[PDB]
Amino acid sequence: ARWFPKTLPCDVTLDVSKNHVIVDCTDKHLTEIPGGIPTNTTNLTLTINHIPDISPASFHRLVHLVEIDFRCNCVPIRLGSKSNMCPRRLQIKPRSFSGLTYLKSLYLDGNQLLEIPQGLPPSLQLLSLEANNIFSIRKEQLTELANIEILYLGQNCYYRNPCYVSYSIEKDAFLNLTKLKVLSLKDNNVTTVPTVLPSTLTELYLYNNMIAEIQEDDFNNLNQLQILDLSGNCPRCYNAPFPCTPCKNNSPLQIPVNAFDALTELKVLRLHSNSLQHVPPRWFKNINNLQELDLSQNFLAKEIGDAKFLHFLPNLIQLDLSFNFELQVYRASMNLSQAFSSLKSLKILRIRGYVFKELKSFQLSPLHNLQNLEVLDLGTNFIKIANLSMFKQFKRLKVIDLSVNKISPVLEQLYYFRYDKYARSCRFKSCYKYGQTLDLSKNSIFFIKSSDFQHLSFLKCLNLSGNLISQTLNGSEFQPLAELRYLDFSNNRLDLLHSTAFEELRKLEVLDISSNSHYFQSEGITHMLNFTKNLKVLQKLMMNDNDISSSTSRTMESESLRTLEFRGNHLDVLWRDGDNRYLQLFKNLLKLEELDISKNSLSFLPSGVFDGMPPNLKNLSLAKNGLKSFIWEKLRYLKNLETLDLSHNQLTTVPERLSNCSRSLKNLILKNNQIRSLTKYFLQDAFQLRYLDLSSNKIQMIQKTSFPENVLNNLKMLLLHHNRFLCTCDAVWFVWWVQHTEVTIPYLATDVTCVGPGAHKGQSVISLDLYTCEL
Amino acid sequence: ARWFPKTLPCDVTLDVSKNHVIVDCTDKHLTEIPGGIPTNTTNLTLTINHIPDISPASFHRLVHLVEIDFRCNCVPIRLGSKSNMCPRRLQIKPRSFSGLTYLKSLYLDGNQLLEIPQGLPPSLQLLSLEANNIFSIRKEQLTELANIEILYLGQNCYYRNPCYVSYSIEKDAFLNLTKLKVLSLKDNNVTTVPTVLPSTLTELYLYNNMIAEIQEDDFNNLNQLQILDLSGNCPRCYNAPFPCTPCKNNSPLQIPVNAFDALTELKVLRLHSNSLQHVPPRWFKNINNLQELDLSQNFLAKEIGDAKFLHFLPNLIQLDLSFNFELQVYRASMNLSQAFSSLKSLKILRIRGYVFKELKSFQLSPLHNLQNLEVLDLGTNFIKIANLSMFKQFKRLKVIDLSVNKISPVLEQLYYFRYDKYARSCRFSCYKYGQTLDLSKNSIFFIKSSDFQHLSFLKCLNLSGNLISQTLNGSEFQPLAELRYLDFSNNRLDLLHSTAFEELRKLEVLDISSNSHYFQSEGITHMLNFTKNLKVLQKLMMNDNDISSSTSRTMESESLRTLEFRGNHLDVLWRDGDNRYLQLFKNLLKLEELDISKNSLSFLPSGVFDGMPPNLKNLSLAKNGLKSFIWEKLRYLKNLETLDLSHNQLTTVPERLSNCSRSLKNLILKNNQIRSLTKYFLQDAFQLRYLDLSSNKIQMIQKTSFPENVLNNLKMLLLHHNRFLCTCDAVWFVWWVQHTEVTIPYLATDVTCVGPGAHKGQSVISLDLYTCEL
RNA sequence: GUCCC
RNA sequence: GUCCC
Ligand SMILES: *[C@@H]1O[C@H](CO)[C@@H](O[C@@H]2O[C@H](CO)[C@@H](O)[C@H](O)[C@H]2NC(C)=O)[C@H](O)[C@H]1NC(C)=O
Ligand SMILES: *[C@@H]1O[C@H](CO)[C@@H](O[C@@H]2O[C@H](CO)[C@@H](O)[C@H](O)[C@H]2NC(C)=O)[C@H](O)[C@H]1NC(C)=O
Ligand SMILES: CCCCc1nc2c(N)nc3ccccc3c2n1Cc1ccc(CN)cc1
Ligand SMILES: CCCCc1nc2c(N)nc3ccccc3c2n1Cc1ccc(CN)cc1
Ligand SMILES: *[C@@H]1O[C@H](CO)[C@@H](O)[C@H](O)[C@H]1NC(C)=O
Ligand SMILES: *[C@@H]1O[C@H](CO)[C@@H](O)[C@H](O)[C@H]1NC(C)=O
Ligand SMILES: *[C@@H]1O[C@H](CO)[C@@H](O)[C@H](O)[C@H]1NC(C)=O
Ligand SMILES: *[C@@H]1O[C@H](CO)[C@@H](O)[C@H](O)[C@H]1NC(C)=O
Ligand SMILES: *[C@@H]1O[C@H](CO)[C@@H](O)[C@H](O)[C@H]1NC(C)=O
Ligand SMILES: *[C@@H]1O[C@H](CO)[C@@H](O)[C@H](O)[C@H]1NC(C)=O
Ligand SMILES: *[C@@H]1O[C@H](CO)[C@@H](O)[C@H](O)[C@H]1NC(C)=O
Ligand SMILES: *[C@@H]1O[C@H](CO)[C@@H](O)[C@H](O)[C@H]1NC(C)=O
Ligand SMILES: *[C@@H]1O[C@H](CO)[C@@H](O)[C@H](O)[C@H]1NC(C)=O
Ligand SMILES: *[C@@H]1O[C@H](CO)[C@@H](O)[C@H](O)[C@H]1NC(C)=O
Ligand SMILES: *[C@@H]1O[C@H](CO)[C@@H](O)[C@H](O)[C@H]1NC(C)=O
Ligand SMILES: *[C@@H]1O[C@H](CO)[C@@H](O)[C@H](O)[C@H]1NC(C)=O
């Protein structure tokens, strides 16, 4: 169907709207720019390769380039792979870019460059030099950048990439970059704000440096500035998981009261980890548009109880005051200033790491009439006491987050303590939707009763994951939660003695009781898995990793359940050969469409398992079972089966004729098995098939009878990589078909490979020339 | 060093004291008996193979066989592999055993046999026919067994191997087996005790059958019987994890009051799962020697409060009354009869599954003066309340077991609920420190010193699997002045204070594994230098804690010999460019064993090895995804004896091992990506004694890499599952493997050529390379 | 591949 | 293969 096979080891995409020819060679183990890149290429990505040099030959024919992404072909040693260290810094010979008359974006991050590359064309708008070894900025090296708008220079001198000196910037180095809008000098050992900066700046990043003082005129001319980040100058170093040097004498970053007066457009001010003890109101006199203020990791514990500056912030959207606790102090309560009541626009308030014992309703009163408040984050506070009923005054909120506390009767897991939360990777550049969420995960709740939730009937999602709840539920414990749609009960010690557990939650749509294995791990104890009958609108049930090997009831029943996750249990024991009692465990889940019984140690499936499946089953996973055999003809019982996942097993054969096993099957996943050959008529007349994964098997040969053309051209995707293809003359049809097909087959360039014979070992089949088979 | 390579795919051993030649072909994927078995073989084991028949040719030459173990060459379908099902039952041709004039033991279990094989020699003492399809025993088929002493016929008719009829035994079938001592008819669908049995019987196994009634004379003549097991006749079926049919009408197994009167020698009586509601004292009138009584899984809840029969058991050593609870009843307390006080000899008492809310000191008083009592097991009782101080009255005990309860302020994990605890396979802990209180798997959320009042005698305390989410500061275990072992795993320890555990001044072993909770939340203080105060601590386990951060930079101890640090995040702690924790273990000055496997260490930053403590002997770096390894840094480890690098991604070995470590004895490199050895790999590495290179991708090994003066002082050399290329370049290695005295496992099954073409899949031990010498 | 799984 | 790991 193709006349010219594509052999370039890069993905090529056409977006004819934007006249873009997109060539993506990311992570192709290239040691040179491959030949044959399209002459019309506009976006070329070569990030993560080991191309040791650039020269005028590099992009000779590619005059239409608007973007070159040439990152991380020589990453600094501590930042890069230790198994494939870059032996030499990238070399850029003269004139490699001056021909690129339309080049607007150049990324040379992560190449151990020692200087700002010269000869760049005046069309350039974005230059990125992060994670190089450039630590002295001279005005002369910048004259070439007259039209630059975006300039990334950070991560060139810090602990993961040291330069052993202070960063140097010549006076007015940037002043004549009259279009410069974004300047990033983060993570660079900078000691002062460089001046004078061009007044076109909209975003200025100076965080993670060694700036001890702001001069009162450092930002005098920046009347267009919208984002300013000075964080991590005079850091708060307690429990830092990176080497951290504080300013002497516990001093804060010193900011004159009038330092921000020019910044009338400022929307984002980030003052994280500046060891601040006070926030002067005078800072915000002329900033009336501020929307985001980060004051986390300072020493503002007492200031939070005073906080006059909040009176100047009526348009603030987000406020972060996390991790301001005084060292070795466990306060009795949280003292929030009445001034918080003037934050009329506030949507998001975070005060993690304040560290206090008892939360009481009146302490949140400054927040009662914040009418736009959506998120209240009081996580990681070691709170021991909290009457949850107090949140009856907060029904307008979307998320109340008390995660990680000690209460008893979506940010990354590293967030406040990582070095640079916004740093780029070499590679690239949850129940809230249900309604009001109370997040009590990772607390010390050992026993629950109905009155714990009094006045919380508005809740839609309750997260109790990771508490200590070791209790037989009998339907009395959640009685006030009449509107709850989602309960996360995972990582507790549920004791399913009663089939009435959870039945008070009459609107429940999703229940997670995964990782409640404790009572399932002790022999002779009663478990009622038929508790589903009472939950009349339950759509999704997760009971993964419960180690379930026994059940007192023999059937689960539901008129509503659509999805059951049963991964990580012991159906192999429940379905012990000769024991027929549980072969219909799921049969009466009459609306069940999705069943995950992967990781159940099912080395074989006893007869009756498929007949015992509920009638509308569409999506079945049997992955990661150590399955060693499979009677494909039993799929005939699964009359609505569309997706079958058999990945990561030990199958050695496929059925003689897939179409004779299932008339409905669309998606067949067989990756990571032990298959060495296909049957002669494998896919004959399998007209419903749309997706086939045979990757990571041991296939040597595929003949045309197995893969008829009228089935292949209906496939959305066919995965074949990481097999054991033998590239002899017996393989001519398969090699020809692979080279010429339009069917999507991923990894042709790197993992659809010959293992033999001798000559062709390690060769991609897409490049294979078999003319000698036709002489 | 050998003149004749052994190519027989079986292990052959000589024990010349007993004139035994032991040939073990277990699980060799054989489809025939191999030729060339030693003519002098006395023990031949062929278990787990697919040999479809036996004939006079089978053992022609093996006149000296005393034992044939030919089990499981055709196992019943529900018991056997579904990926390699046996297609047809083992065929035994006539005259196959009659020549075996010295044969004393024949195991034919698991072969789908339909009848008792005939033509067996008169020397036979033991015959085993378990897991076949023999369900009718006729006296004529047993005449050949005149001299038999041990006869195993069980598992021929039960739910994993049905016969669809009742088992049949002819009247007096066994009577003329005048030397028969052990008879097992378990798991067989038997409906009555077969009579008359020979009076030589010492052991009679009739459990897991369908016997509804004992006749008063069923055991009349059995005056030598020492073990009788009638369990699982009229089973208690509640929560049975196997298909279970109870006797009709809720009846127990019906046993007349005098049924045991002849059994004067009886030592073991097993009446597990007989749905008994009463235990008549009259049963034990004439049994004065009984030592073991199993009454678990009956309905004896009310009998336990009465139990007059215990007065007749002054020599009982072991008593099991577990799982006798009444259905749907949660008793307030445990009512133990005073009659328990007459069990003068009792060492072991187990009452799991009695099911009661509150354990109370006076409830145990009948046990106060049982002076040989060693184990009290009250696990799985859903006890909510128990003052632990009550065990001040039980300091003589070795184990107090309250595991699996709900207390708050060594039997397998399947035991009382498995179908047959004693069934055979086809193929075949802190008590030692002293008084042990097992509180594992309860609901303890908070501990304080008074919880342990009067328990200073305890040597081992098990708190694993509780709910303890608490900062310890050294005040919580003050009375436990003698404790040597604390299992604190699977809780939520909060190491805020470096004074944690310092009150346990006799502590030698501390397990705080799987206390990851407080370690996985960022910004929290953790004091890993808490070891400094524990002056006699030998072993510390802190596996699976997800430790990625620490407030202190060094752990210190003068005593610790063993640290288990598996399943943490030293990769994050030792982030490249952060030097602060590179001496975390340096000041564990007596540390000999360090397990830092499963730490995501894809590389080791420079300084990790210099930071190791000086006496390190045994280092595991397994399961780290290690991609590179600067072998020369092993020079820092001057006492290193064992290095475990298994399950990583290493691709090379050092150019010269001897230049990396003068001390290294054991190098484990299995499951890596090594494709070739360096030219002089083991040159002059005379200290090396154990080398595991299995499951790599080695194609070729030459003598320069593997000098012989090093190889033959190796206790073991593991090479299986590689990618050996068997060309004429391999002539030295093939010869050396064929002729070496060094132990190399799996030669018969996984030391294999992958090429070239001709030799693919061929064992290197069988390889003939004469064409390389033409 | 008799119990486990 | 810049932050994660
Ligand atoms: C940031 O700059 C400081 C100096 O301003 C560097 O510190 C010097 O480091 C050298 C070599 O490590 C020492 O010999 C000097 O004594 C240091 N000088 C001072 C004034 O402390 C520091 O190394 C730089 N940081 C990074 C990450 O490169
Ligand atoms: C044990 O023996 C009983 C009979 O005593 C078997 O039960 C019969 O089984 C067949 C086939 O399942 C039925 O058609 C009969 O109706 C049954 N009869 C009665 C009276 O139950 C039973 O199958 C045997 N058990 C085993 C494990 O083989
Ligand atoms: C060995 C006992 C098997 C049956 C069982 N299972 C459980 C269980 N999963 N949780 C319990 C929790 C508290 C008390 C008893 C049980 C219990 N029990 C005992 C029990 C169950 C039910 C009742 C009636 N509420 C009384 C007692
Ligand atoms: C964001 C807090 C980091 C420091 C820290 N770590 C912990 C910890 N591991 N457990 C605690 C348990 C209770 C109270 C406070 C802490 C605590 N804290 C705060 C704290 C620690 C110590 C003290 C003095 N007892 C008071 C307060
Ligand atoms: C291509 O490059 C241009 C110029 O920098 C950029 O605006 C655009 O987003 C890029 N598109 C893709 C798909 O890489
Ligand atoms: C809260 O703290 C502020 C400042 O420390 C103080 O003005 C105020 O009185 C305190 N309020 C309470 C209730 O402690
Ligand atoms: C919690 O507050 C609610 C609502 O104000 C009140 O009804 C209840 O008494 C309080 N509960 C406790 C245990 O203090
Ligand atoms: C509940 O919180 C846990 C623990 O933080 C989290 O992993 C989980 O995704 C949350 N569940 C939902 C449904 O948001
Ligand atoms: C359920 O248990 C709760 C808590 O023990 C109790 O208040 C209630 O009486 C029980 N209800 C039923 C119907 O058993
Ligand atoms: C669940 O099954 C048990 C029988 O094992 C029965 O007692 C109970 O009533 C059932 N419950 C429901 C809700 O079906
Ligand atoms: C089938 O279910 C799996 C969950 O295991 C899901 O990830 C996948 O997208 C589903 N596929 C289809 C085609 O619905
Ligand atoms: C499978 O193929 C045979 C032969 O064409 C046909 O008789 C049979 O009905 C088919 N079965 C199914 C389930 O398609
Ligand atoms: C060898 O066979 C004899 C005869 O049954 C037996 O007594 C002995 O224990 C067996 N030893 C081994 C190691 O198989
Ligand atoms: C403590 O009990 C646990 C849980 O039953 C068990 O796994 C562990 O081996 C015990 N510890 C010791 C030291 O015996
Ligand atoms: C440790 O905590 C206990 C618990 O209340 C307390 O009695 C004791 O004073 C504390 N010890 C120290 C040294 O702080
Ligand atoms: C452990 O280190 C911390 C500081 O990192 C110190 O406060 C504490 O006293 C030390 N404790 C011991 C036992 O060394």
The per-residue DSSP string of A419-472 comes to S-TTPPPTT----GGGS-EEE--SS------GGGGTT-TT-SEEE-TTS----B
Q: B577, A159: Cβ pair inside 8 Å?
A: yes
How many alpha carbons fall within 13 Å on the CB side of residue A567? 15
Ligand 13 atom with minimal separation from the B15 CA: 13
Residue tagged 């040719």 (tokens): B57
Which amino acid is located at A318 in the chain? Q
What is the number of structural domains in chain B?
1
B333 in Cβ contact with B378 (< 8 Å): no
Experimental method used, please?
X-ray
Q: Which residue is nearest to nucleotide C3 (CA to C1')?
A: B423
Whole-number Å distance, alpha carbon A476 to ligand 9 midpoint, is 6
The three-class DSSP label of residue B169 is strand
- Give Cα separations from A401 to A293, A305, A376, A438, A696 (angstroms): 20, 21, 6, 6, 43
Strand C and B78 CB separated by under 7 Å: no
Tell me which residues of chain A, numbers 257 to 276, contact chain B at a CB-CB cutoff of 8 Å: none
Domain span including residue A308: 1-775
B664 in Cβ contact with A118 (< 8 Å): no
A143 known member of a binding site: no
Q: How far is A440 from chain B (nearest CA, A)?
A: 15
> What are the structure tokens assigned to B381, written together?
């009782």
> What are the structure tokens assigned to B120, written together?
């067996």
Alpha-carbon torsion angle B210, B215, B216, B218, nearest 10: -80
How many alpha carbons fall within 13 Å on the CB side of residue A679? 13
Of A243, A446, A604, the CB nearest to B445: A446
Q: How many CB atoms lie within 10 A of CB B448?
A: 12
- Give Cα separations from B45 to A369, A740, B57, B72, B156 (angstroms): 84, 58, 17, 11, 22
Interface A–B counts its CB contacts (< 8 A) at: 128
For the Cβ of B441 lying below 6 angstroms from any atom of ligand 14, the answer is: yes
Mutation target for A interface from B522, B568, B603, B673: give the one with most A CBs within 10 A.
B522
Ligand 9 atom with minimal separation from the A449 CA: 4
B611 in Cβ contact with B584 (< 8 Å): yes
Question: Å between A548 CA and C5 C1'?
Answer: 14
Chain A contact for B761, CB < 8 A?
no
Question: Å between B579 CA and D1 C1'?
Answer: 21
Q: How many CB atoms lie within 10 A of CB B494?
A: 22
Mutation target for B interface from A157, A237, A468, A603: give the one with most B CBs within 10 A.
A468
Q: How many CB atoms lie within 10 A of CB B606?
A: 14
DSSP β-ladder status, B20-24 and B11-15 = antiparallel
Which amino acid is located at B31 in the chain? T
Of A413, A446, A578, the CB nearest to B522: A413
Report the alpha-carbon distance of residue A95 to residue B376 in Å, rounded: 87
Q: A523, B414: Cβ pair inside 8 Å?
A: yes
Report the alpha-carbon distance of residue B207 to residue B274 in Å, rounded: 10
In strand C, which positions have an atom below 7 A from any protein CB?
1-5
Ligand 12 atom with minimal separation from the A636 CA: 13
B195 known member of a binding site: no
Chain B contact for A762, CB < 8 A?
no
B74 in Cβ contact with B111 (< 8 Å): yes
The three-class DSSP label of residue B232 is coil
B626 in Cβ contact with B649 (< 8 Å): yes
DSSP secondary-structure letter at B610? T
Of A83, A406, A446, the CB nearest to B467: A446
Q: What angle do CA B332, B337, B342 make, to 5 degrees?
A: 150
Ligand 9 atom with minimal separation from the A476 CA: 1
> What are the structure tokens assigned to A48, written together?
């993560």
- Give Cα separations from B402 to A152, B322, B458, B467 (angstroms): 64, 13, 15, 16
Which amino acid is located at A25 in the chain? C
Report the alpha-carbon distance of residue B374 to residue B382 in Å, rounded: 23
Chain B contact for A83, CB < 8 A?
yes
Beta partners for A93? none
Q: Which residues line ligand 11 (CB under 6 A)?
A: A 594, 596, 619, 621, 643, 667
Whole-number Å distance, alpha carbon A114 to ligand 1 midpoint, is 18
The three-class DSSP label of residue A12 is strand
Report the alpha-carbon distance of residue A708 to residue A474 in Å, rounded: 57
B401 known member of a binding site: no
> What are the structure tokens assigned to B405, written together?
């309860």
Experimental structure resolution, Å: 2.2
Report the alpha-carbon distance of residue B625 to residue B187 in Å, rounded: 48
Tell me which residues of chain A, numbers 23 to 42, contact chain B at a CB-CB cutoff of 8 Å: none
Strand C and B242 CB separated by under 7 Å: yes
DSSP secondary-structure letter at B318? E
Nucleic chain C: which protein residues 103-142 of B have CB below 7 A from it?
107, 109-110, 128, 130-131
Of B243, B524, B525, the CB nearest to A579: B243
> What are the structure tokens assigned to B578, written together?
């952060």
Q: Which residues line ligand 2 (CB under 6 A)?
A: B 157-159, 162-166, 189
CATH number at residue A397: 3.80.10.10
Of B380, B415, B577, the CB nearest to A78: B577
Beta partners for B400? B376, B437
Bond preceding residue A196 cis, omega within 30 of 0? yes
Chain A contact for B523, CB < 8 A?
yes
Question: Å between B63 CA and D5 C1'?
Answer: 65
Report the alpha-carbon distance of residue B249 to residue B252 in Å, rounded: 9
Residue tagged 């910037």 (tokens): A169
> Of how many residues is chain B composed?
774
DSSP secondary-structure letter at A117? -
Which residue is closest in CA terms to ligand 2's atom 22? B164
> What are the structure tokens assigned to B718, written together?
């593991």
Bond preceding residue B745 cis, omega within 30 of 0? no
The three-class DSSP label of residue B758 is helix
N- to C-terminal Cα distance for chain A? 24
- How does DSSP assign B683-730, residue by residue? TT-TT--EEE--SS------TTTS-HHHHTT-SEEE--SS-EE-SGGG
Which stretch of DSSP H or E encloses residue B294? Answer: strand B292-294
DSSP β-ladder status, B20-24 and B43-45 = parallel
Whole-number Å distance, alpha carbon A389 to ligand 7 midpoint, is 6
